[PDB]
Design a protein around this nucleic acid. Structure first.
Lengths: 103, 110, 43, 48
RNA sequence: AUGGUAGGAGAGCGUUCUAAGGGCGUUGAAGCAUGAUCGUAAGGACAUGUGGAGCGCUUAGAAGUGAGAAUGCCGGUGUGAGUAGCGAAAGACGGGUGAGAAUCCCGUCCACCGAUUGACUAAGGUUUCCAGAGGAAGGCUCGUCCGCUCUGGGUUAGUCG
RNA sequence: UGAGGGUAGCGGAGAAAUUCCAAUCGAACCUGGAGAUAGCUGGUUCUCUCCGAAAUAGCUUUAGGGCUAGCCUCAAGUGAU
RNA sequence: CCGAUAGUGAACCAGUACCGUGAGGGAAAGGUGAAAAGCACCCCGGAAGGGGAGUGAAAUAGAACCUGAAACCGUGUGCUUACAAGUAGUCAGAGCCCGUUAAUGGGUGAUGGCGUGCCUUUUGUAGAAUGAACCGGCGAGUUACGAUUUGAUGCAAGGUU
């Protein structure tokens, strides 16, 4: 269960073994979006505040289960758990101790 | 080398459009246009627009010269019919039939 | 020729319509039937 | 007014062999324009 | 030595599950629909299409089990004709507009109703009223009108009801 | 002739016709009893078994229906019948 | 177990369209996601096409992304086939082909003889007796629970639930 500033590895899909940073999250349908990963080619018409339009090569959302956090100590994909430190809940890395993310 | 065009869901019944489609079949494109100009039938202008569309396809997309082309196939398929209730008689139904007109044009070579 | 059903607003509200149906017991039974069926218009 | 038996495909199409369109006239436009109706200065490019 | 709409005890198949066993299957596995096999069956193991993730075989058990008609019902579909009909009445020409006009608009002439096919008020109907613009359908055409779209809309009372 | 009222189905209304009560009337319409009852008509299918029965007397609040006998299939039995 | 003519009439716009003055009656239509990435871009006529283009592991996967089938019906190609009297087939053969899930294989289409339905109801019908194109929800044998007649046994001086 991952957050907006994280650094992930993709474990399933066309990009596989690639890594990246998540940049939006869309949690009510479980789809993160990672930079450099799952690039679409959108046919975008001429808009009122735009030129005729491009092939718009941007990232498409990927399901959240194809992505795993990288252990900060060993750089392996790991699952996460929760440690309770002083009423606060932190994510731990399940092969080591804490993984710190704010961005 | 073959170009084609179709016109889909044209609101003329197919029996009436096959009559004039039987005139232009297997003729040259220029004399086909002349036959379509000298028939007063309701569907000669529709068919002529499909034929001009197929000759434009052949010139623009396949670079065929449009003075050697013959009308290789020309046919009309049934499209989906629309059911209307005639109020003018006594409650009996009237179908608006529609058709699909396909024309393919070619130079006879390979 | 003259037909059955010559409309009239006052007559229509007076033989059917809410206050006439609530004024007898069988009329209240038609409104209870129409509620229970889930009709959009009770009268 | 009624048919006793339905007509088949072959009888329907045997009835339609005279039901067709004749080929038009075409005296060609020698001065300018599209080919016009025979003995006409026809209304679209007539140069008879 | 070995026919019977009524007869007895027969071996079998489509759906489902056990209750199993054993398979075909995400380098593809189907099923289903187009293929030479099996056949009295009913019912299943290898070329197109499909997809693109679902089925068989064996043994046994259970049946929303069990598919040419009932003037059967219908999700229903589609035929059998260029036939019948197009719902009373006078229009003609010129111009215009348009992708395109017996149809729309303007003109002139002609015609019809005239105790009414005129003008008001009730009931009833409820936005059809008026402008713009496309009408994919609507009109027993076209739109190049309204009775689709947008709003621009639009209904004003001390004395009328 | 208009407007507003009234009379309701085992009933009403009728200068009387079995006439009219929402295109319905020798007894309206809707729901329910209700899958009424139908000794009558029509239908009754994916198997294929193999082999094997055929078809009149008697009685009938009821007689083109029914019941018992006859003509039956299948299974046991006795066993010269 | 309903697996969606479904426990529901209604897993969608449902007691809604609509029908009836009113009580009341009462449908049809269900179905991405791999991800709209839904044909920017670009080129010929309004609709519709032809091209490229694409997130397209695959658009005859284009708003009918639940795909998606069949049959009826089509329609345009062709191979063989045109002195006659017709339950249209069957049994007796010139032209044209050529073979899978394989071996008197696989055929295709021309001639002289002979020629009456699911059917139903009948002494008797094939209609001048009845009823009828294609597809299908999809359309005609439980138990409360008894009786009587046709496998295995506690298990047979024996019968319990």
């Amino acid at each position: 269960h991952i957050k907006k500033g994280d650094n992930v590895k993709v474990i399933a899909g066309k990009d596989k073994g690639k890594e990246g940073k998540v940049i939006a999250t869309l949690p009510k349908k479980d789809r993160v979006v990672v930079e450099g990963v799952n690039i679409m080619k959108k046919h975008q018409k001429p808009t009122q505040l735009n030129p005729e339009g491009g092939i718009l090569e941007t990232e498409a959302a990927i399901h959240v289960s194809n992505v795993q956090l990288l252990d900060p100590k060993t750089n392996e994909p790991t699952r996460v758990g929760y440690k309770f430190v002083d009423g606060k809940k932190v994510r731990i890395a399940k092969k080591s101790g804490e993984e710190i993310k704010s961005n | 080398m073959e170009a084609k065009a179709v016109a889909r869901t044209i609101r003329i019944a197919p029996r009436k459009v096959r009559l004039v489609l039987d005139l232009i079949r297997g003729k040259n494109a220029a004399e086909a246009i002349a036959i379509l100009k000298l028939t007063n039938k309701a569907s000669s202008p529709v068919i002529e627009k499909v034929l001009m569309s197929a000759l434009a396809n052949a010139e623009h997309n396949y670079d065929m010269n449009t003075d050697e082309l013959v009308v290789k196939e020309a046919y009309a398929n049934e499209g989906p019919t629309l059911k209307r209730f005639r109020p003018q008689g006594r409650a009996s139904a009237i179908n608006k039939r529609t058709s699909h007109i396909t024309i393919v044009v070619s130079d006879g070579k390979e | 020729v003259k037909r059955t059903y010559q409309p009239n607003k006052r007559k229509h509200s007076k033989v059917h319509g809410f206050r006439k149906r609530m004024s007898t017991k069988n009329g209240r039974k038609v409104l209870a039937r129409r509620r229970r069926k889930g009709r959009k218009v009770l009268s | 007014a009624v048919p006793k038996r339905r007509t088949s495909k072959t009888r329907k199409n045997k009835r339609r062999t005279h039901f067709k369109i004749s080929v038009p006239g075409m005296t060609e436009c020698p001065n300018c324009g599209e080919y016009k109706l025979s003995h006409r200065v026809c209304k679209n490019c007539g140069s008879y």
